[PDB]
Amino acid sequence: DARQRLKEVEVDDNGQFMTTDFGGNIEEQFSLKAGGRGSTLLEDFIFRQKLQHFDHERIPERVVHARGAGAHGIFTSYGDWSNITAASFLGAKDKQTPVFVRFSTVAGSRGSADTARDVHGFATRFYTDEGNFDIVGNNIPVFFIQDAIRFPDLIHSVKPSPDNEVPQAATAHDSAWDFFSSQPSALHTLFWAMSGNGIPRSYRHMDGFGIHTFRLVTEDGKSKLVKWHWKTKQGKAALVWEEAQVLAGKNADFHRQDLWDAIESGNAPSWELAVQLIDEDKAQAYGFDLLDPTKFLPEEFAPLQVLGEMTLNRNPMNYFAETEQISFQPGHIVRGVDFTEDPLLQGRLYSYLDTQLNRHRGPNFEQLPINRPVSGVHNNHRDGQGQAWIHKNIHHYSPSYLNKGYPAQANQTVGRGFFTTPGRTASGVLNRELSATFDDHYTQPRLFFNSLTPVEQQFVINAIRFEASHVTNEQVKKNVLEQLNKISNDVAKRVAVALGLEAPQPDPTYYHNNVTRGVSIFNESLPTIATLRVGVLSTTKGGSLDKAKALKEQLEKDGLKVTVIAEYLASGVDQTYSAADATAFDAVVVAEGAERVFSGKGAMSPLFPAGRPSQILTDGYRWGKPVAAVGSAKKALQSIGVEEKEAGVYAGAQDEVIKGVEEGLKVFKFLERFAVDG
């Protein structure tokens, strides 16, 4: 159990009497009053201690990535990696380390929808035996800006307008596109966020990246440049925008519920930790600067080397105490890892420590159970708000005769201390500049765009079209088109259509036809369909329900999550049509007989909104899902103009339908149903 160490702070209230926070059994359902219909007394200490605690429950949300959810798990090293790093969690084959991971969006406040379009956070803590080591990453390998000092500028621009606080969790507004076009570094991350990476199917279907180049350091002090990757074993998958929008309203908790359910059902998700490793002398060798976080290193120049595997297999017991309170920091580093002079990373080191002072209202947040390391804390720090320990050493300073030199200094040679890469040097003038090697903001967005399938490219074009059309200022729209044109004239032209503007003439400076592997989502089938959801549309009349039970039983034996839907909660029904929506499912199947709810009187119950069963099948089809109908239920497919012969559409007997649906779920989205320009 990855949560084992947290057991000593767990509190069980079953079989107990109610108490105050200072002990003493009480009742707390009536205010103390002066007379039968009298005023409440100030001396009601019970009322005040209960309401005070309630009045003070909230803490500030994260300044970014406020909306998210997480889980505990175990990382297992596949090897002794001492030849590349001194890091203890990677020091032996099969070595296990507890982890906690939180996934998130970026812009939205705490109750905003999971399926907003946004960059996503993918933050991992390794509770190693040499300190907490955090890889605070995203589901996208590049970031918007090149110097951390511009972070408040980027974030102010994407978050709601400060006059009216509109719009929630969206970049589809004037200020965001003003910034993206005024600060062209942002274009690469923008293209990723406008692709499937912006609207992923689940946290479990995301890759993760540390983005920055870091250093791995061996005991002897030799270093290699490194990029961290998390490769999902569930495969990458994404929604379509028109679906993501409805899902935002039908279930704002889609991703947090997905993760929660997969873990409770014994379908713990896994990722492999992989690295790209290059020599220090390769920093500027690949057509860009490895200190520049707006570029990624194509796998063709440095392949992924898999180091181990992380599996998330325990949900938290209390979301607030665990998920909400956990405090990640890129500054949480251990012996065997070091920073690079990435100007974005450099500033992060400051920001994450500092911001905890606001979020936790004090300096002792590392003492919180979810934040505590497993490896022991020994230093001369004392006092501070909420100090939870009692220190035995009264000689709380170094150097000192009186404490006999304890706690002692550790370094590269003694006590496995942290050490900065010994060969790192500084040279030149102090400067408030960036290197000219950072200047190409256009080649890699083009590389990314080139490496998507034609329909994936259309999705990127259509996301930009949707978003940019919300921009009220004409000149900002023109600015956006000018910047897009430096990446691809075709992209600019196709976006300009939606905006009713003329794209600038081609500017070939940065155009190219190069492609790189592994950045596409829809181009590869899923390696497993376990946990994928099948909505089975049935009815309470006749024999549909019994056949739906049989369909469900078969699908579930093959790892699927099945919801039987009907007009009311009859035996064997999981959900009502009133409560159902296509956004909740990965595949939609009409059980035989259920065709009666697609036309005629069966479609007109006061138990569900008009057209509801037809709408679910319609949404399912148009959003590219596998859709199907058993036997006479083909009439339902016919009712919405969908033909049996189409890809991702299945009819016939339960056996043909099950096999076809399961094969379609590997494809996941049928992209032939989406129109492409021309």
- The answer to whether residue 308 forms part of the interface with ligand HEM (CB under 6 A) is no
Contact 118, 107 (CB under 8 A): yes
User: Which of ligand HEM, a copy of itself, none binds 256 (CB below 5-8 Å, type-dependent)?
Assistant: a copy of itself
User: For this structure, is 523 an active site residue?
Assistant: no
Query: Closer CB to a copy of itself, residue 146 or residue 539?
Result: 146
- The answer to whether residue 272 forms part of the interface with a copy of itself (CB under 8 A) is no
**Ramachandran class of 389: left when φ > 0, alpha when ψ lies in -120 to 50, beta otherwise:** beta
Query: Closer CB to a copy of itself, residue 181 or residue 539?
Result: 181
3-state secondary structure of 434: coil
Query: Residue 445, preceding bond cis, omega within 30 degrees?
Result: no
Q: How far apart are CA 18 and CA 11, in angstroms?
A: 13
- DSSP E strand boundaries for 546-640: 561-566, 575-576, 587-590, 627-630
* Beta bridge partner(s), residue 306: 274
Contact 552, 580 (CB under 8 A): no
Q: Give me the least distance between CB of 221 and a copy of itself, in Å please.
A: 11
- The answer to whether residue 469 forms part of the interface with a copy of itself (CB under 8 A) is no
Region binding ligand HEM by CB under 6 A among candidate stretches 5-13, 136-144, 519-527, 553-561: 136-144
Interface with ligand HEM in residues 276-295 (CB under 6 A)? 293
User: Which of ligand HEM, a copy of itself, none binds 321 (CB below 5-8 Å, type-dependent)?
Assistant: a copy of itself
Q: Give me the least distance between CB of 559 and a copy of itself, in Å please.
A: 22
- The answer to whether residue 291 forms part of the interface with a copy of itself (CB under 8 A) is yes
Query: Closer CB to ligand HEM, residue 187 or residue 591?
Result: 187
Q: How far apart are CA 641 and CA 657, in angstroms?
A: 19
Region binding ligand HEM by CB under 6 A among candidate stretches 134-142, 216-224, 416-424, 449-457: 134-142
- The answer to whether residue 273 forms part of the interface with ligand HEM (CB under 6 A) is no
Interface with a copy of itself in residues 238-267 (CB under 8 A)? 240-242, 245-253, 256-257, 260
Q: Which residue has the tokens 């190219």?
A: 512
Q: What is the DSSP letter of 533?
A: E
Instruction: Determine how β-strand 121-128 pairs with β-strand 131-138.
Output: antiparallel
Instruction: Determine how β-strand 587-590 pairs with β-strand 649-652.
Output: unpaired
Interface with ligand HEM in residues 226-265 (CB under 6 A)? none
Q: Which of 551, 625, 577 is nearest to 201 (CA)?
A: 625
Q: Give me the least distance between CB of 511 and a copy of itself, in Å please.
A: 28
Give every CB contact of residue 250 below 8 A, 6+ residues apart in sequence: 581, 583, 584
Interface with a copy of itself in residues 384-423 (CB under 8 A)? 384-404, 406-411, 415-418, 420
Task: By CB under 8 A, name the one of 84, 99, 113, 297 that touches a copy of itself.
Answer: 113
Contact 229, 208 (CB under 8 A): yes
Q: Which residue has the tokens 């707390």?
A: 28
Edge-to-edge order in the sheet of strand 587-590: 575-576, 561-566, 533-537, 587-590, 627-630, 649-652
Interface with a copy of itself in residues 421-460 (CB under 8 A)? 425-435, 437
User: Which of ligand HEM, a copy of itself, none binds 164 (CB below 5-8 Å, type-dependent)?
Assistant: a copy of itself
Interface with a copy of itself in residues 162-191 (CB under 8 A)? 162-169, 174-175, 178-179, 181-183
Query: Closer CB to ligand HEM, residue 160 or residue 293?
Result: 293
Backbone dihedral angles phi then psi of residue 150, each to the nearest 5 degrees: -90, 0
Tokens describing residue 515: 């492609």
* Cβ neighbours of 655 (radius 10 Å): 10
Task: By CB under 8 A, name the one of 277, 353, 498, 515 that touches a copy of itself.
Answer: 353
Tokens describing residue 329: 């920091």
Backbone dihedral angles phi then psi of residue 476, each to the nearest 5 degrees: -65, -45
Radius of gyration of the chain from its Cα atoms, rounded to whole angstroms: 28
Interface with ligand HEM in residues 41-80 (CB under 6 A)? 51, 55, 62-65, 68
Region binding a copy of itself by CB under 8 A among candidate stretches 51-59, 135-143, 442-450, 469-477: 51-59
User: Which of ligand HEM, a copy of itself, none binds 641 (CB below 5-8 Å, type-dependent)?
Assistant: none
Burial of residue 170 (number of CB atoms within 10 Å: 0-12, 13-18, 19+):
buried
Tokens describing residue 493: 């032209």
User: For this structure, is 371 an active site residue?
Assistant: no
Task: By CB under 6 A, name the one of 352, 418, 466, 674 that touches ligand HEM.
Answer: 352
**Size of residue set near a copy of itself by CB under 8 A:** 214
Q: Give me the least distance between CB of 134 and a copy of itself, in Å please.
A: 9
Q: What is the DSSP letter of 409?
A: P
Burial of residue 580 (number of CB atoms within 10 Å: 0-12, 13-18, 19+):
buried
Indicate the residue type of 523: N
- The answer to whether residue 363 forms part of the interface with ligand HEM (CB under 6 A) is no
Q: Give me the least distance between CB of 490 and ligand HEM, in Å please.
A: 29
Tokens describing residue 325: 């309170």
User: Which of a copy of itself, ligand HEM, none binds 490 (CB below 5-8 Å, type-dependent)?
Assistant: none
Task: By CB under 6 A, name the one of 131, 137, 269, 336 that touches ligand HEM.
Answer: 137
**Size of residue set near ligand HEM by CB under 6 A:** 29
Tokens describing residue 60: 């500030």
Region binding ligand HEM by CB under 6 A among candidate stretches 225-233, 344-352, 475-483, 556-564: 344-352
User: Which of ligand HEM, a copy of itself, none binds 111 (CB below 5-8 Å, type-dependent)?
Assistant: a copy of itself
Which residue out of 72, 120, 132, 138 is catalytically annotated?
138
User: Which of a copy of itself, ligand HEM, none binds 27 (CB below 5-8 Å, type-dependent)?
Assistant: a copy of itself
Region binding a copy of itself by CB under 8 A among candidate stretches 230-238, 340-348, 461-469, 495-503: 340-348
Backbone dihedral angles phi then psi of residue 290, each to the nearest 5 degrees: -65, -10
Query: Closer CB to ligand HEM, residue 367 or residue 479?
Result: 367
Q: What is the DSSP letter of 499?
A: H
Residue 621 annotated as part of some ligand binding site = no
Burial of residue 229 (number of CB atoms within 10 Å: 0-12, 13-18, 19+):
buried
Q: Give me the least distance between CB of 126 and a copy of itself, in Å please.
A: 11
**Residues of each annotated binding site:** 352
* Residues labelled as active-site residues: 65, 138
**Residues of each annotated binding site for heme:** 352
Interaction site with ligand HEM (CB under 6 A)? 51, 55, 62-65, 68, 102, 104, 121, 123, 136-138, 143, 148, 151, 211-212, 293, 327-328, 344, 347-348, 351-352, 355, 359
